[PDB]
Design a protein that fits this description.
CATH class of chain A: Alpha Beta
Structural class of chain A: alpha+beta
CATH architecture of chain A: Roll
Oligomer: homodimer
Number of domains of chain A: 1
CATH topology of chain A: Nuclear Transport Factor 2, Chain: A
Strand order of the largest sheet of chain A: 2-1-6-5-4-3
Largest sheet of chain A: 6 strands, mixed
Pfam families (chains A, B): SnoaL_3 (PF13474)
Strand content of chain A: 35-45%
Shape of chain A: globular
Radius of gyration of chain A: 14 Å
Distance between the termini of chain A: 31 Å
Largest interface: A-B, 35 and 36 residues
Order of helices and strands of chain A: HHEEHEEEE
InterPro entries (chains A, B): NTF2-like_dom_sf, SnoaL-like
């Protein structure tokens, strides 16, 4: 439930560090959407794969990300995840996963900015 | 697109003022989830109907909040809506709609609090 999803997040978070986006795309749906940065979205597994490869080599001067509070709003088929990420300063994101027939939760909407996208 | 959803919001917003939750439940999915207030969620059309009937009076509507910026992250089947509501002070919510076979977008996750649910 709240764990397997939290385990998929980490699984992906790692798949990104190991720069093996080939295994990272197994967690995304085919028509998924990923918000790279404000006013910049990638649609489809291919476009999203490229986005990660592009923004692969980027880092913040002295920064220590840390998983924080995480709420899950499950509505049967889909699930809205509100993941807070601590910097030392926080980053509240909104992810949407959809459980396919196989029973594996894939990501459909990846907006690491959450409602911050508005402001 | 961005309008029909915005028109569904208003449609519901009104269905609530006219206290005719019978027509309001036509906009929600069957296994939908509604966040009434922090640490309080209603699951299923029935529970959600009761929730609205209960807080019919707890919340003084008529206080028509002003619609503001609204971002839509569509991923084929589902759609993540980031609606900002102005008070005069703002309220950034996160709604999730899913387009059924009939082609009508229903609400599956109604969290008028957005990422604020975390903090």
């Amino acid at each position: 439930m709240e764990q397997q999803l939290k385990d998929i997040i980490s699984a992906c978070d790692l798949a990104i560090q190991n720069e093996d986006f080939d295994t990272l795309m197994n967690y995304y749906s085919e028509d998924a959407v990923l918000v790279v940065k404000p006013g910049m979205i990638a649609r489809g597994k291919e476009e999203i794969k490229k986005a990660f490869i592009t923004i692969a080599n980027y880092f913040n001067h002295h920064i220590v990300p840390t998983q924080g509070k995480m709420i899950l709003l499950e509505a049967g088929d889909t699930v809205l995840v509100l993941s807070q990420t601590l910097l030392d300063m926080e980053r509240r994101a909104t992810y949407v996963f959809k459980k396919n027939a196989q029973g594996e939760w894939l990501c459909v909407i990846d907006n690491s900015y959450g409602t911050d996208l508005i402001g």
